[PDB]
């Protein structure tokens, strides 16, 4: 490791036996530049700027995950089949900008210390589940090898909201509350 | 709860003073245990835990595998930095500063990059949140206080907001 | 000019 001017992951490669599933994404200074939809075989950049000027071949991703799948098989045997331990994630909710009644905003649900990277994050306007207006990031890497994931909800401030998180490291599902 | 075996590979570059110092580290990780790595500073593969020797001993025994991982400093690090230089590193984003009592909070919302300097005009009886990350290339930082002058690399003249 | 990327080494059978 280091404490350098700019830290970049040109390949957060991820693959797990459960599913099975995997993730390929590049990061710069702790933010996600793009992930690759492994089933759609399409490089999905995360800023318009990047979409206008940067190109990455999804094939390099699919190749890399093929290696992880094999690699995982040998390390499973060598580790005498040592399974991943579930972590207890922490959840924070906050707004992209200060709240003004009748001014469009975005709620931001930070799910932190995710391991394994398998999670449900679902928003709640009162008791009801919000289907539309939701977006999220991929699992972003932490130097302690766990992940964080941020979910977003565009909303109109009115006269309550809940971020509902399901994870194997929790007993019951966790709901973090937020009101204006 | 369902059983799971997790694998991670972390090809990381480290840049200092432009590229006057470049360094790569690739990390092979079983679940959360990094077991083998390649540091461009060492120049060979090394076992990080007793889970690594078989992999590292085998990887150093292939010239091809060595030279190629070594070369990734040019073909991954140096090669991508030019493309960061064109894009990421010119992404200057103007912050938004307002003041609201709760203490009178000087919240500084939506800016890039991280390097920022908020101070109260010029006594210090203050409290400040860690540098919050939105996950979409903007940062939040609320600086509580029991005129707010905010300095960010993107602003020519520093932003000054009176009470 | 496309993006470079690291490639993981094969674990040994």
């Amino acid at each position: 490791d280091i404490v350098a001017d700019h830290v970049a992951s040109y390949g957060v490669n991820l693959y797990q036996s459960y599913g099975p599933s995997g993730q390929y994404s590049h990061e710069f200074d702790g933010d996600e530049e793009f992930y690759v939809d492994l089933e759609r075989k399409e490089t999905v950049w995360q800023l318009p700027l990047f979409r206008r000027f940067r190109r990455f071949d999804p094939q390099f991703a699919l190749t890399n995950i093929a290696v992880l799948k094999h690699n995982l098989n040998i390390v499973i045997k060598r580790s005498n089949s040592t399974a991943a331990t579930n972590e207890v994630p922490e959840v924070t909710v906050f707004s992209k900008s200060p709240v003004t009644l009748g001014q469009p905003n975005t709620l931001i649900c930070l799910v932190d210390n995710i391991f394994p990277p398998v999670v449900n994050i679902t928003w709640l306007s009162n008791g009801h589940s919000v289907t539309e207006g939701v977006s999220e990031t991929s699992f972003l890497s932490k130097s302690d090898h766990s992940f964080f994931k941020i979910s977003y909800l565009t909303f109109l401030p009115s006269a309550i909201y809940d971020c509902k998180v399901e994870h194997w490291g929790l007993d019951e599902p966790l709901l973090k509350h937020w009101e204006p | 709860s369902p059983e799971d075996f997790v694998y991670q590979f972390k090809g990381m570059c480290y840049f200092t003073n432009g590229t006057e110092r470049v360094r790569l580290v690739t990390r092979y990780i079983y679940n959360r245990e990094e077991y083998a790595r390649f540091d461009s500073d060492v120049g060979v593969y090394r076992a990080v835990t007793p889970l690594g020797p078989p992999a590292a001993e085998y990887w150093n025994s292939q010239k091809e595998v060595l030279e190629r991982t070594r070369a990734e400093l040019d073909t991954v690090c140096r090669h991508n930095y030019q493309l960061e230089l064109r894009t990421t590193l010119q992404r200057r984003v103007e912050p938004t500063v307002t003041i609201s009592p709760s203490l009178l909070v000087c919240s500084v919302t939506d800016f890039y990059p991280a390097q920022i300097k908020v101070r109260w005009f010029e006594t210090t009886g203050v409290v400040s949140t860690p540098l919050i990350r939105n996950g979409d290339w903007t940062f939040q930082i609320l600086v509580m206080l029991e005129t707010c002058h905010v300095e960010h690399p993107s602003l020519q003249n520093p932003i000054i907001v009176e009470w | 000019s496309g993006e470079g990327s690291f490639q993981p080494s094969q674990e040994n059978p």
Partner: T-cell receptor
Amino acid sequence: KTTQPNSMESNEEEPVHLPCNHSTISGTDYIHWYRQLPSQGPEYVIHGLTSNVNNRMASLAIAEDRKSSTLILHRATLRDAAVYYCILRDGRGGADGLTFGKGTHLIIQP
Amino acid sequence: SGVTQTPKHLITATGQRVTLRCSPRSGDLSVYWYQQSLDQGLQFLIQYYNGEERAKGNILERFSAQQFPDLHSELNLSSLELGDSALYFCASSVAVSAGTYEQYFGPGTRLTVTE
């Protein structure tokens, strides 16, 4: 695309310099040289990225601007008379780069 | 090198379908299929890594391949045509990539397709 001379003759015992052009080489591209004896299948000679590389088979001189290269064989015998392909591959691999082109017929006569 | 391939020589009528076998180097995990023709040079067809398909080239729909669990591969050429008369090469690689690794080739199949 790479471009190479169609044919090339050199005497036995003498060094041979086989030329190859590739003006649009990328920063992520490696240069590969393979040979193929008439009856036999093809076989790896050498590969490189920058400056000079030498294995127990041959030497490879890549130009300063990386837009050309030279496969050098220090001593050539009848057993080195074969076809020589010059290939650009991405260090990472993938389809576009596996296919061998026309190559060069290197004739070795006494 | 240590790449075996069968059958060495092959003569078949048009419209027919034959299958070419290849066992790669013992330590290796990749197989590449190539077609060398007088007019096309040494063309890449299809690559398999660790059992599943990895890279496709200019394989016709009339062509089919796969890599089995023991890592050997088969290549079937359906509705054989005159122009399909070519030299067919199997290749082997330790890893998924040949960008920085060498490829070890087999003897190849000599296939003529006659009227």
